[PDB]
Design an enzyme around this catalytic site. Structure first.
Site, PDB file in Angstrom:
ATOM      1  N   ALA A  35      32.018  41.490  33.176  1.00  0.00           N
ATOM      2  CA  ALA A  35      32.608  42.071  33.851  1.00  0.00           C
ATOM      3  C   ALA A  35      33.058  42.128  35.324  1.00  0.00           C
ATOM      4  O   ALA A  35      34.307  42.849  35.794  1.00  0.00           O
ATOM      5  CB  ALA A  35      30.820  43.518  33.856  1.00  0.00           C
ATOM      6  N   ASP A  36      32.050  41.877  36.210  1.00  0.00           N
ATOM      7  CA  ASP A  36      32.530  41.535  37.986  1.00  0.00           C
ATOM      8  C   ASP A  36      31.043  41.582  38.671  1.00  0.00           C
ATOM      9  O   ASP A  36      30.115  42.039  38.656  1.00  0.00           O
ATOM     10  CB  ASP A  36      33.683  43.220  38.495  1.00  0.00           C
ATOM     11  CG  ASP A  36      34.681  42.267  39.085  1.00  0.00           C
ATOM     12  OD1 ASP A  36      35.849  42.872  38.404  1.00  0.00           O
ATOM     13  OD2 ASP A  36      35.143  42.326  39.990  1.00  0.00           O
ATOM     14  N   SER A  37      31.281  39.857  39.447  1.00  0.00           N
ATOM     15  CA  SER A  37      29.973  39.595  40.688  1.00  0.00           C
ATOM     16  C   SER A  37      30.039  41.172  40.979  1.00  0.00           C
ATOM     17  O   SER A  37      28.816  40.511  41.847  1.00  0.00           O
ATOM     18  CB  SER A  37      30.843  38.035  41.261  1.00  0.00           C
ATOM     19  OG  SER A  37      32.254  38.912  41.974  1.00  0.00           O
ATOM     20  N   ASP A  39      30.788  43.464  41.408  1.00  0.00           N
ATOM     21  CA  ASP A  39      29.837  45.197  40.796  1.00  0.00           C
ATOM     22  C   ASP A  39      28.665  44.688  39.890  1.00  0.00           C
ATOM     23  O   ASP A  39      27.787  45.606  40.118  1.00  0.00           O
ATOM     24  CB  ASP A  39      30.732  45.398  39.419  1.00  0.00           C
ATOM     25  CG  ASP A  39      32.129  46.115  40.087  1.00  0.00           C
ATOM     26  OD1 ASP A  39      32.124  46.724  40.502  1.00  0.00           O
ATOM     27  OD2 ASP A  39      32.845  46.486  38.836  1.00  0.00           O
ATOM     28  N   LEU A  40      27.957  43.442  39.483  1.00  0.00           N
ATOM     29  CA  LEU A  40      27.129  43.159  38.967  1.00  0.00           C
ATOM     30  C   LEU A  40      25.970  43.538  39.815  1.00  0.00           C
ATOM     31  O   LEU A  40      24.971  43.793  39.653  1.00  0.00           O
ATOM     32  CB  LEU A  40      26.436  41.780  38.104  1.00  0.00           C
ATOM     33  CG  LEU A  40      27.240  42.315  36.682  1.00  0.00           C
ATOM     34  CD1 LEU A  40      26.023  43.130  35.525  1.00  0.00           C
ATOM     35  CD2 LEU A  40      28.825  43.249  36.256  1.00  0.00           C
TER      36      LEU A  40
END
Length: 79
Positions: A35-37, A39-40
């Protein structure tokens, strides 16, 4: 109370409504679904921030796996 998944679905849905069908891969949260660093790290920060714990750099390195996840919530939060 459905394991860490609960708070995990509220953080991922409140942060970025996505498909959790790929979140609980029992592998990684930001290394599996890709997903995304940032974001997570966002949704996660909310999970603990609400759980009132002392986590910070251990969450992202724990919740990543369904195992460590339910272990970080069960060991810390006791309802």
């Amino acid at each position: 109370l459905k394991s860490t998944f609960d708070d995990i679905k509220k953080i991922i849905s409140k942060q970025l409504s996505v498909e959790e069908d790929k979140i609980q891969m029992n592998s990684n949260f930001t290394k599996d679904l890709g997903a995304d660093s940032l974001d997570l790290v966002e949704l996660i920060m909310a999970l603990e921030e609400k759980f009132n714990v002392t986590i910070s750099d251990q969450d992202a390195l724990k919740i990543n796996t369904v195992q460590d996840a339910i272990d970080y919530i069960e060991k810390n939060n006791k309802q």
